Amino acid sequence: MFNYESILINEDVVSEMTIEDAKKLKPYWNVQIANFKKSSKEPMFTLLQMAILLNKKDIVGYLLARRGLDINALSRNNQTALMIACDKKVPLDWIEAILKRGGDLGINIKDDYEQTALDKCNFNSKAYHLLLKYGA
Amino acid sequence: NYESILINEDVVSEMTIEDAKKLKPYWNVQIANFKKSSKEPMFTLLQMAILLNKKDIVGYLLARRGLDINALSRNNQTALMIACDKKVPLDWIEAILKRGGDLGINIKDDYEQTALDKCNFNSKAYHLLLKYGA
């Protein structure tokens, strides 16, 4: 929403968000709208990306099921939902849901530090092995 | 600091309930920290499991009779405090409180914060803490 003359909500707003709120932000599903309070007053993350970062399982579940949502949409630092999910070691079932929904198409996307989602998994982790199944 | 007891988030992320069972002598011990942070252990296994959203290890440990639900991290944080701070599901917070986490509801960390202070104002978590005497 129109906070600090931009499109900006913080982690406080997203932590308290319900599926009804996610639905009302439909025009914004592919838009960088969220950032942490500590950081600068420009949006960094999509709602899906911030939901993953804050472990909002019900909002993550709802958004991945949406028609018209770009699962490979980039954060302001050129990160995907898949990259963030791997970096934060979220449950393997969310990583699989991301990949099966079209996250596999962006599996070789690289962030500002030349890192892919595979590079964010630990050596021989269950995450590493799953990404290899989907073509990493 | 010793790497003798330290396990990091890489070890805990790959951990199963079989591993948690084998660590029983250590359930009240500061054993875990992130690679970015100090080599010195900060968190209990339950506390690290909550920070990494390991639902099966969290569910198993909360059921254990030998585990002190009010055990302190090295910076004097409880499982309840960390669960509130990381906005984890309400069911986990309620399980912690009913398990004896209500006895430590007014514990204050090194930054003079309680579990209530780590909840968002008017959240369902905030209201539940008030019910149990925050």
Structure description:
The structure is a homodimer. In chain A, helix 5 (81-87) runs antiparallel to helix 6 (92-100). Chain A has one domain: Serine Threonine Protein Phosphatase 5, Tetratricopeptide repeat. With 136 residues, chain A is mainly alpha-helical. The longest helix of chain A has 9 residues, at 92-100. Helix content of chain A is 40%, strand content 0%. Chain A has helices at residues 11-15, 19-24, 47-53, 57-64, 81-87, 92-100, 117-120, 126-133. The first copy, chain A, is built from 8 helices and no strands. At the A-B interface, loops of A face helix 1 of B. Chain B: It comes from Plasmodium falciparum (isolate 3D7). Chain B: This is Ankyrin-repeat protein, putative. It is classed as structural protein. The entry lists the keywords Protein-Protein interaction, invasion Complex, structural protein. The assembly is dimeric.
Key terms:
homodimer, 136 residues, mainly alpha, Serine Threonine Protein Phosphatase 5, Tetratricopeptide repeat, 40% helix
